[PDB]
PDB file of N, CA and C in Angstrom:
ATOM      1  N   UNK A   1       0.839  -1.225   0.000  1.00  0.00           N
ATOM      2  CA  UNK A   1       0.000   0.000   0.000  1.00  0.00           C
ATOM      3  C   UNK A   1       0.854   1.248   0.000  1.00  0.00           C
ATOM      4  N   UNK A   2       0.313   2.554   0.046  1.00  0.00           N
ATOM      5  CA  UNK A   2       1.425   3.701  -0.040  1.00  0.00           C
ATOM      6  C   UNK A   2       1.636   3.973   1.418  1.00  0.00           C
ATOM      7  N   UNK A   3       1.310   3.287   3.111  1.00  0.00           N
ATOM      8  CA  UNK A   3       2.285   3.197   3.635  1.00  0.00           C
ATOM      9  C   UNK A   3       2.360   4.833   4.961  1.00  0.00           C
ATOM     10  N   UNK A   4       2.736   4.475   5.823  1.00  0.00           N
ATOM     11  CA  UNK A   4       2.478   5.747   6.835  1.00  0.00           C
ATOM     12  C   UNK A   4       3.869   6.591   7.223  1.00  0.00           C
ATOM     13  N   UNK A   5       3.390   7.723   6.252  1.00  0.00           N
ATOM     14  CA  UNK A   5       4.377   9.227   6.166  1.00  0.00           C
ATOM     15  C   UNK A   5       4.149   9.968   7.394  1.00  0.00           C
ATOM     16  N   UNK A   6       5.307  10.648   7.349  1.00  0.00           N
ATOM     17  CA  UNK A   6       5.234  11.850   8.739  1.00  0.00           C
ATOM     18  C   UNK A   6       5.004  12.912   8.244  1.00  0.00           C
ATOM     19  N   UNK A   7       4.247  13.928   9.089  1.00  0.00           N
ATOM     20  CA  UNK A   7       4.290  15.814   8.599  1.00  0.00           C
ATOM     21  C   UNK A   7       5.214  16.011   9.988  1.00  0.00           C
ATOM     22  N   UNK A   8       6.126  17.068   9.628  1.00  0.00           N
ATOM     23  CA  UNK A   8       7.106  17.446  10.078  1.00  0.00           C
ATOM     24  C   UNK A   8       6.591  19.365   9.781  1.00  0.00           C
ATOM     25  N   UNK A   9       6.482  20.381  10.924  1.00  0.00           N
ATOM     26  CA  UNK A   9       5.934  21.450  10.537  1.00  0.00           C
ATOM     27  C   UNK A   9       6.971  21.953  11.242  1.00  0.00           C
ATOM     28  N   UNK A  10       8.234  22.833  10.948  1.00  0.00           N
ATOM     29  CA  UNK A  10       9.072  23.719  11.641  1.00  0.00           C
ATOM     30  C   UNK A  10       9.236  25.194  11.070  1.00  0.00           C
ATOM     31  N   UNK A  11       9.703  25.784  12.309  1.00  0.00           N
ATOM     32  CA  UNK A  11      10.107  27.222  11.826  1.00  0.00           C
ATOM     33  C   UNK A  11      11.445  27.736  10.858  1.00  0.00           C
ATOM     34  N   UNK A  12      11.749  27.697  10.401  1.00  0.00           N
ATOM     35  CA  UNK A  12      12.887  28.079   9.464  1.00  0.00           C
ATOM     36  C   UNK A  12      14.016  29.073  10.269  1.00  0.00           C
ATOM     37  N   UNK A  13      15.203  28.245  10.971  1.00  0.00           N
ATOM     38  CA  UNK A  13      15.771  29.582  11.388  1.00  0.00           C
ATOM     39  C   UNK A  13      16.948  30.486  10.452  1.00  0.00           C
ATOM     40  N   UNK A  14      18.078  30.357  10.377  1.00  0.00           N
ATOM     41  CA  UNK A  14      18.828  31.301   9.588  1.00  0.00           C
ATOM     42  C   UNK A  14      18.904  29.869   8.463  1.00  0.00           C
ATOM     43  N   UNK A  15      19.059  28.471   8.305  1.00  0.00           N
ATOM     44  CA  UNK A  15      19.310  27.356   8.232  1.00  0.00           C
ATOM     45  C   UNK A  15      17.696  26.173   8.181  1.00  0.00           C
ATOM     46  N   UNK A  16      18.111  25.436   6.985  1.00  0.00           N
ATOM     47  CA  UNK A  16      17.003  24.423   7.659  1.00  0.00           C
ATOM     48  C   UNK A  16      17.562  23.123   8.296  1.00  0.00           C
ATOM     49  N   UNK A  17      18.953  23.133   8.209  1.00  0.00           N
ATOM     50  CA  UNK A  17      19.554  22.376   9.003  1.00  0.00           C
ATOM     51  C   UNK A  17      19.494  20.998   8.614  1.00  0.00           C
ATOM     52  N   UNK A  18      19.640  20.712   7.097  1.00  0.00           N
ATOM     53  CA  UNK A  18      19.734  19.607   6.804  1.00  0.00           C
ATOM     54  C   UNK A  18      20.404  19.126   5.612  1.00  0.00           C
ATOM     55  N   UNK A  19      21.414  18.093   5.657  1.00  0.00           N
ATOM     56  CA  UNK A  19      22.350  17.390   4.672  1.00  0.00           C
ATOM     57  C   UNK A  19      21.539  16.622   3.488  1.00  0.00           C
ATOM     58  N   UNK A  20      21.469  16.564   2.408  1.00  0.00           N
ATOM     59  CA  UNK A  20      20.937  15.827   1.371  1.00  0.00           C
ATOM     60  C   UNK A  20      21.533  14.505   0.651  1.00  0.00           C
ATOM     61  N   UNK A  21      21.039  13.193   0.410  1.00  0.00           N
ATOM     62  CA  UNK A  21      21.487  12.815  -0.634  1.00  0.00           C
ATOM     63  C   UNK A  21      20.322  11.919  -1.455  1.00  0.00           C
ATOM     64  N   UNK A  22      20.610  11.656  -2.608  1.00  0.00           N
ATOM     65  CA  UNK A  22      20.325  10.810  -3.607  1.00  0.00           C
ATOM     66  C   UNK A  22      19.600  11.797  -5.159  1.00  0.00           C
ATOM     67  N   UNK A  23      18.916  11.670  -5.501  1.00  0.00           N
ATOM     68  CA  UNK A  23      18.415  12.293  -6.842  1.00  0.00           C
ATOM     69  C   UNK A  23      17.636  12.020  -7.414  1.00  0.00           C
ATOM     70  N   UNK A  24      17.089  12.144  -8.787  1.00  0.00           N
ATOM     71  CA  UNK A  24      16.327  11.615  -9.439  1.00  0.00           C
ATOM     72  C   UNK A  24      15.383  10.829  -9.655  1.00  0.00           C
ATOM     73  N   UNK A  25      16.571   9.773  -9.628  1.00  0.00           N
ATOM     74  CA  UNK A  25      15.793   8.464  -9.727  1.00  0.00           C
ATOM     75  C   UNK A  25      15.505   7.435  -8.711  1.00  0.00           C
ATOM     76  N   UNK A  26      15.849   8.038  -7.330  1.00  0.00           N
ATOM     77  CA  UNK A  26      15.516   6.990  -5.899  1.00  0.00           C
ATOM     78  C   UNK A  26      14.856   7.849  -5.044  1.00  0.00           C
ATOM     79  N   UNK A  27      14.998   8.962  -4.865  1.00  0.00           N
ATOM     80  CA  UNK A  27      14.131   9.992  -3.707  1.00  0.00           C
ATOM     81  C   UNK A  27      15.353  10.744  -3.265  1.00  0.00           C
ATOM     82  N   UNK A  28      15.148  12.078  -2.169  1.00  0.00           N
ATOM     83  CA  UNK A  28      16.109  12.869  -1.796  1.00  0.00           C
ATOM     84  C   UNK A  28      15.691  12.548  -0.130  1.00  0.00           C
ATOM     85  N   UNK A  29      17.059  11.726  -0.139  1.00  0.00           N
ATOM     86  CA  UNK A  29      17.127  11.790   0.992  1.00  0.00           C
ATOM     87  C   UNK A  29      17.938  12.742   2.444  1.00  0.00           C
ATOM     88  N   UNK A  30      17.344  12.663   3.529  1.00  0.00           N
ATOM     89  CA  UNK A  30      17.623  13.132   5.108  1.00  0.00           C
ATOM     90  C   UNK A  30      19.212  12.480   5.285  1.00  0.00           C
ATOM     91  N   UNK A  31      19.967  12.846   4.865  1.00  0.00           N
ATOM     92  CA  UNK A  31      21.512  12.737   5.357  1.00  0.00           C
ATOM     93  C   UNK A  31      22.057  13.048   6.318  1.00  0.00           C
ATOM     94  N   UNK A  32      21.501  13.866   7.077  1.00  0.00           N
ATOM     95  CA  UNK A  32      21.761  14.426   8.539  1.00  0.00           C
ATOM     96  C   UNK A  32      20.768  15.475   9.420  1.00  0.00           C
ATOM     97  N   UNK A  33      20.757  15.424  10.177  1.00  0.00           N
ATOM     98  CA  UNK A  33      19.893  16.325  10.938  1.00  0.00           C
ATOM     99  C   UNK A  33      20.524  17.550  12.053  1.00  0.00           C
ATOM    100  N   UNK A  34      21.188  18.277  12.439  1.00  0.00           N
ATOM    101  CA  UNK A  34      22.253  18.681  13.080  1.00  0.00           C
ATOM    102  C   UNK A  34      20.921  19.034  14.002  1.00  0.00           C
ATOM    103  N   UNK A  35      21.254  18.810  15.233  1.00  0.00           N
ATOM    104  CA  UNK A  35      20.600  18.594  16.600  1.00  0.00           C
ATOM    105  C   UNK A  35      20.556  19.852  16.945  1.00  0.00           C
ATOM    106  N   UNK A  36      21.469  21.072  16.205  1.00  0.00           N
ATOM    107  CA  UNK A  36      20.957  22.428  16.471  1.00  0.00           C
ATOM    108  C   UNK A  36      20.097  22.704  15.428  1.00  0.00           C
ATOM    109  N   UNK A  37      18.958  22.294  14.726  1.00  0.00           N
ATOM    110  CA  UNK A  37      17.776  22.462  14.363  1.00  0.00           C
ATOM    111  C   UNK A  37      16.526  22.440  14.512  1.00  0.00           C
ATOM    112  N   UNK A  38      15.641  22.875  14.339  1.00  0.00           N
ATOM    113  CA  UNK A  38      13.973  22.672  14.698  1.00  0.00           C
ATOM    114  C   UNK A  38      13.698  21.229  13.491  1.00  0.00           C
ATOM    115  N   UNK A  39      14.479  20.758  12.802  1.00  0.00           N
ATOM    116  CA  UNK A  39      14.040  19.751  11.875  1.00  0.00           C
ATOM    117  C   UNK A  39      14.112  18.692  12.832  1.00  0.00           C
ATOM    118  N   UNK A  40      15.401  18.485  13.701  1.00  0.00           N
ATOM    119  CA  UNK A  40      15.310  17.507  13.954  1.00  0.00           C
ATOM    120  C   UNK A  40      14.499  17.094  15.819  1.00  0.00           C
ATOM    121  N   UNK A  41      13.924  18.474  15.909  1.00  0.00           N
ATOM    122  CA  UNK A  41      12.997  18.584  17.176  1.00  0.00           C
ATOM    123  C   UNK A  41      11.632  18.210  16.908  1.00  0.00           C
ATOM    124  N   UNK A  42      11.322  18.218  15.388  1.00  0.00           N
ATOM    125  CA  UNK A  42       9.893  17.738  14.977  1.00  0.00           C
ATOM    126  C   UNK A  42       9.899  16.441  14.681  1.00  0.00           C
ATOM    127  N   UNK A  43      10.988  15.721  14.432  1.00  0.00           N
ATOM    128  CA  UNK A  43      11.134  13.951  14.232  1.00  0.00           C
ATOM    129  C   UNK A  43      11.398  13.881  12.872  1.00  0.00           C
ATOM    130  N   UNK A  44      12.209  15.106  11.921  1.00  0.00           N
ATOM    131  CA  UNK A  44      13.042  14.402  10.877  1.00  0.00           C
ATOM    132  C   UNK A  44      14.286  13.915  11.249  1.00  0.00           C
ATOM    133  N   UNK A  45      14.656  12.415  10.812  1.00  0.00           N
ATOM    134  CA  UNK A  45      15.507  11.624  11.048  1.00  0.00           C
ATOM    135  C   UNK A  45      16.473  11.669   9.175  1.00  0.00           C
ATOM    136  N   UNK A  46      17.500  10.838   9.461  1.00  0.00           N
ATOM    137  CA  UNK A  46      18.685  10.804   8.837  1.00  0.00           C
ATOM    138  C   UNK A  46      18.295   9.526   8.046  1.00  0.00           C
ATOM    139  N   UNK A  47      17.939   8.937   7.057  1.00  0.00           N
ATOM    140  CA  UNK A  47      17.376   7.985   6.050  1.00  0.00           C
ATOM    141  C   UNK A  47      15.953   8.338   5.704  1.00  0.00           C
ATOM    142  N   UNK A  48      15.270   9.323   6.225  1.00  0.00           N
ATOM    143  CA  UNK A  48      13.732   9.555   5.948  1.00  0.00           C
ATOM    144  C   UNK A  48      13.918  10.018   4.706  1.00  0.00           C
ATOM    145  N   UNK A  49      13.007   9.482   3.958  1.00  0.00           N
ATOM    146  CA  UNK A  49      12.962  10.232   2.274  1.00  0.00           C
ATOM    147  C   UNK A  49      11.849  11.415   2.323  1.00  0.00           C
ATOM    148  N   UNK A  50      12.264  12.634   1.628  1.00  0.00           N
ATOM    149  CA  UNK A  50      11.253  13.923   1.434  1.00  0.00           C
ATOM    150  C   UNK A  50      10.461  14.005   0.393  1.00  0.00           C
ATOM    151  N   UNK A  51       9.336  13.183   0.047  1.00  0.00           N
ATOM    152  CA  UNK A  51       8.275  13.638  -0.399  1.00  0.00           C
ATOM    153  C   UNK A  51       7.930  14.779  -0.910  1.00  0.00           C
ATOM    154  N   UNK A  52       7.929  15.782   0.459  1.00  0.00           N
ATOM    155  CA  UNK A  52       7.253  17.309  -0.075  1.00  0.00           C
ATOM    156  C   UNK A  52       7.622  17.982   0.721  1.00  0.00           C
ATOM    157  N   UNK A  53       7.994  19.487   0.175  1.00  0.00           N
ATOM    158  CA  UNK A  53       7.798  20.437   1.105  1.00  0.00           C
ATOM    159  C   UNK A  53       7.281  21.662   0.636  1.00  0.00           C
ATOM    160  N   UNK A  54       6.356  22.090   1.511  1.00  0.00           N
ATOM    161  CA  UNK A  54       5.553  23.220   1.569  1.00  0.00           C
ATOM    162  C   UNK A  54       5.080  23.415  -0.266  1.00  0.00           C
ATOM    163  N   UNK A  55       4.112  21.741   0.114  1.00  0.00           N
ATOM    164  CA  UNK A  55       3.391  21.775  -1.558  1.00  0.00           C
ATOM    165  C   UNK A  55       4.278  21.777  -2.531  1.00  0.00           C
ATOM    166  N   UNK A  56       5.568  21.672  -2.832  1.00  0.00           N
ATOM    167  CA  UNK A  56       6.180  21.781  -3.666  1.00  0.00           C
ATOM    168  C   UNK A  56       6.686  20.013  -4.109  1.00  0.00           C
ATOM    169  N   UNK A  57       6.651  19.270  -5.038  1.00  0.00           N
ATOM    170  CA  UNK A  57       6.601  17.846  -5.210  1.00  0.00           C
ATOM    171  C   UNK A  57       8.514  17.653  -4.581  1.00  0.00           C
ATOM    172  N   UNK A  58       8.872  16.801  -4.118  1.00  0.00           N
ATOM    173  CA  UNK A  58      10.483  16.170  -4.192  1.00  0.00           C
ATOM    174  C   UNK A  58      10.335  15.169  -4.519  1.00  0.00           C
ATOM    175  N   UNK A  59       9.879  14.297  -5.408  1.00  0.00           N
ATOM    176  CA  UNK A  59      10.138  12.888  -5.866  1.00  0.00           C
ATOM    177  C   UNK A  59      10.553  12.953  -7.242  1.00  0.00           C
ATOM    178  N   UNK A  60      10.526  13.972  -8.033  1.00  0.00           N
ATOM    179  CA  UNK A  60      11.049  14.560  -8.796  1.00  0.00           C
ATOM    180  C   UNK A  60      11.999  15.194  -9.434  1.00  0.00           C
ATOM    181  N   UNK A  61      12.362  15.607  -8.323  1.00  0.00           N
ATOM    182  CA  UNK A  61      13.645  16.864  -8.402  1.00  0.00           C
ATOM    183  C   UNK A  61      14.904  16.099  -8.178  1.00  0.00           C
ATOM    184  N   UNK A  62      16.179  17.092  -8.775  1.00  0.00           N
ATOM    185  CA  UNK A  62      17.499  16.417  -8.505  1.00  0.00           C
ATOM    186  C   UNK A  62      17.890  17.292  -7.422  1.00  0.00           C
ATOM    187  N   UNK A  63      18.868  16.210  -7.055  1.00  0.00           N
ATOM    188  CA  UNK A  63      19.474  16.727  -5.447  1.00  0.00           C
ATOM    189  C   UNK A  63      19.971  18.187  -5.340  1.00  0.00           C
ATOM    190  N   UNK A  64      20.505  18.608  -6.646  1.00  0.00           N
ATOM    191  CA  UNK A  64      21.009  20.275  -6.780  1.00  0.00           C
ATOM    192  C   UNK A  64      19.811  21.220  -6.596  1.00  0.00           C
ATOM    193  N   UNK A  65      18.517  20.931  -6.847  1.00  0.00           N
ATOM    194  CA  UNK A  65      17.668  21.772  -7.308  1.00  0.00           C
ATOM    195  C   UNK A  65      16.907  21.520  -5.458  1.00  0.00           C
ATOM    196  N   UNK A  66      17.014  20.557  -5.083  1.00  0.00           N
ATOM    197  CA  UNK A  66      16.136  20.468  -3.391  1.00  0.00           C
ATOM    198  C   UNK A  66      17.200  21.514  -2.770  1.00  0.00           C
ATOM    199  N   UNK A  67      18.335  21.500  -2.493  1.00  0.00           N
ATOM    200  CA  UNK A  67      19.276  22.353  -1.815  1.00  0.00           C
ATOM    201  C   UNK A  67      18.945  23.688  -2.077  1.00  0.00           C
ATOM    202  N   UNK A  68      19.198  24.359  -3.461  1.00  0.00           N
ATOM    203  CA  UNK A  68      18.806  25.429  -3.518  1.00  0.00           C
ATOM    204  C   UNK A  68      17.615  25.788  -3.081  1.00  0.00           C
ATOM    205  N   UNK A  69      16.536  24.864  -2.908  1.00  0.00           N
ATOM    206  CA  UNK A  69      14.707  24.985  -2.357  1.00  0.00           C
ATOM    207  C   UNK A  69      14.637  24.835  -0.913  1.00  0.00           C
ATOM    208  N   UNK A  70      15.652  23.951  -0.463  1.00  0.00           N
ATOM    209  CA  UNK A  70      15.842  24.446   1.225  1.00  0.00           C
ATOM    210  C   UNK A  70      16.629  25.975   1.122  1.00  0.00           C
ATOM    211  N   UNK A  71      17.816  26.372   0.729  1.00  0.00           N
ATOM    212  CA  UNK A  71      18.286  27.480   1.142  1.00  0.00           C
ATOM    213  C   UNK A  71      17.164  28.319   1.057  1.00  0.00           C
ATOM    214  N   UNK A  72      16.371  28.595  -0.229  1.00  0.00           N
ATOM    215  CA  UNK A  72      15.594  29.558  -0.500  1.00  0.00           C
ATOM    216  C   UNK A  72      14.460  29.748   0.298  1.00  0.00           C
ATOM    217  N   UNK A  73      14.074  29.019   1.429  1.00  0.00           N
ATOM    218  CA  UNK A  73      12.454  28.820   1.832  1.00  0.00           C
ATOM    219  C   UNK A  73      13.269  30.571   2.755  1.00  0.00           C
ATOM    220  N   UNK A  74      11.949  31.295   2.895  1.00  0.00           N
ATOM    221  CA  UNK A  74      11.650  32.410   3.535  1.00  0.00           C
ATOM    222  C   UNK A  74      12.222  32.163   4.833  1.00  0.00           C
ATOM    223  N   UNK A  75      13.305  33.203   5.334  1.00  0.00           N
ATOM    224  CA  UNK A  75      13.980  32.832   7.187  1.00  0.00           C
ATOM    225  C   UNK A  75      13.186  33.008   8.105  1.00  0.00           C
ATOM    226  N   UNK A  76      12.853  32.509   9.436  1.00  0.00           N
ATOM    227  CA  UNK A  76      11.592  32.984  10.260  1.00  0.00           C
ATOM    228  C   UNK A  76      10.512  32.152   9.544  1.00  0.00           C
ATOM    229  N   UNK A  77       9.493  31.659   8.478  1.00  0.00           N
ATOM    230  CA  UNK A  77       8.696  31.556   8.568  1.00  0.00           C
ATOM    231  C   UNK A  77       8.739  29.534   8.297  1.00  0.00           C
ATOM    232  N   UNK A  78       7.409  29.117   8.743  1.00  0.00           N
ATOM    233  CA  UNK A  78       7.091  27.973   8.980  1.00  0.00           C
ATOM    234  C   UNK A  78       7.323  27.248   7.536  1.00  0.00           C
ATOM    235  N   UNK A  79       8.170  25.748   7.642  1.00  0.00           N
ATOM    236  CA  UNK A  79       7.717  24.865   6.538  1.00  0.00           C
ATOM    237  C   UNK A  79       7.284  23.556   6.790  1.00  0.00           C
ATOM    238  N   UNK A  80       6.997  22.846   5.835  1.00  0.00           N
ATOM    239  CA  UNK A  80       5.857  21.921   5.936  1.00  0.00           C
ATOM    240  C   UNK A  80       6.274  20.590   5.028  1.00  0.00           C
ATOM    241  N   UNK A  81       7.298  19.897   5.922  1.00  0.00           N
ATOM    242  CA  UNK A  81       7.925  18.673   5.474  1.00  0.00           C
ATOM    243  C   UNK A  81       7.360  17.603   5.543  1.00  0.00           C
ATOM    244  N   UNK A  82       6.636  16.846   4.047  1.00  0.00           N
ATOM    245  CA  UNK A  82       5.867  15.364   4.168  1.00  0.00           C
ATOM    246  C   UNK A  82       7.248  14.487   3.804  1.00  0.00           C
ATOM    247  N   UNK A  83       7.240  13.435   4.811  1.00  0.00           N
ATOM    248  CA  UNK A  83       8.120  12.648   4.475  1.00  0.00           C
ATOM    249  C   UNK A  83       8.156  11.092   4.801  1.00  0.00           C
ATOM    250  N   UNK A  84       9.182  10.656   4.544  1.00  0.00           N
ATOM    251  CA  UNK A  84       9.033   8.715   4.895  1.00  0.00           C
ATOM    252  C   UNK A  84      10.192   7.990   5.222  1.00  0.00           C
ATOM    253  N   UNK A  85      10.044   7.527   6.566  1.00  0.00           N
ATOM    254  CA  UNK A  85      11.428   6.927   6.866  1.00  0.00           C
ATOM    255  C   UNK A  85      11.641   5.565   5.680  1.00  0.00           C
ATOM    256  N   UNK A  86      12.456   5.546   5.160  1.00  0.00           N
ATOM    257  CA  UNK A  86      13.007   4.490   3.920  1.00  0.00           C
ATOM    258  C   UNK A  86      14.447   4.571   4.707  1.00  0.00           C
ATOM    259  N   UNK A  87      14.893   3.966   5.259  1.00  0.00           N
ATOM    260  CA  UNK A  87      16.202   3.348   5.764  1.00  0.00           C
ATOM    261  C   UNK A  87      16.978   2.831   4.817  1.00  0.00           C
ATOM    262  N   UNK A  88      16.612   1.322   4.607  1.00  0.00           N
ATOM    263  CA  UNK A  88      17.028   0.395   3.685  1.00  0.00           C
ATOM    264  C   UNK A  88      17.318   0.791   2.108  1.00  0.00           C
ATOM    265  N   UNK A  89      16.260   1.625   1.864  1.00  0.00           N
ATOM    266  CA  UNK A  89      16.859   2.308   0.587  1.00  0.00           C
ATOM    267  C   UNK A  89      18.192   3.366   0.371  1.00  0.00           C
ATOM    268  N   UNK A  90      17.923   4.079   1.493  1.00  0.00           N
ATOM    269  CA  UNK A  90      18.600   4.851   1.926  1.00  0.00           C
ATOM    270  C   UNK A  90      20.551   4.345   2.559  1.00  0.00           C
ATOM    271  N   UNK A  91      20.647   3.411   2.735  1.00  0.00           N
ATOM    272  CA  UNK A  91      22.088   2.729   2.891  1.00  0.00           C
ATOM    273  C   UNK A  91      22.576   1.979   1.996  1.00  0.00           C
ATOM    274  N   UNK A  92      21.954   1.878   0.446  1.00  0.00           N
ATOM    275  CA  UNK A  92      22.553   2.118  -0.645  1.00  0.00           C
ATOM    276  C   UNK A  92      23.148   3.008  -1.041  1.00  0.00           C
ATOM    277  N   UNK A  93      21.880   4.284  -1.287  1.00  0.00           N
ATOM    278  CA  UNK A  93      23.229   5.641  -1.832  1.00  0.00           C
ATOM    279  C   UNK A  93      24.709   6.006  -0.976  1.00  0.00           C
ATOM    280  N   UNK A  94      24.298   5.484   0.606  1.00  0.00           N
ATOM    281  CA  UNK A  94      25.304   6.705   1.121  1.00  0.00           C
ATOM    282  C   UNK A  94      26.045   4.929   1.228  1.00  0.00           C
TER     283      UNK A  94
END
């Protein structure tokens, strides 16, 4: 079935405080979470794959183009991370 995703809703501080990997063709994954973030105070973890954020599709996008879409989200204001712990997929790429 398609399986039970997390919403992850944080404030954006100077940083969204998070490492990327994979691309294209497997999902963009949660590579790190640095414990000085609000990402990783809402329960994004380090193998969770990103789905979405703030309505914008990531199953799509290449890993260059999510980075620039985290730097760019507005500083101070709230975003809105759908996502899915995928582990096992996830200790292939890295």
């Amino acid at each position: 079935g398609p399986g039970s995703m997390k919403l992850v809703k944080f404030r954006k501080g100077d940083s969204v405080g998070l490492r990327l990997a994979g691309g294209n063709d497997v999902g963009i994954f949660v590579a790190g979470v640095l414990e000085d973030s609000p990402a990783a105070k809402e329960g994004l973890e380090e193998g969770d794959q990103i789905l979405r954020v703030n309505n914008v599709d990531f199953t799509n996008i290449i890993r260059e183009e999510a980075v620039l879409f985290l730097l760019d989200l507005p500083k101070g204001e709230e975003v809105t991370i759908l996502a899915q712990k995928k582990k096992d997929v996830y200790r292939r790429i890295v």
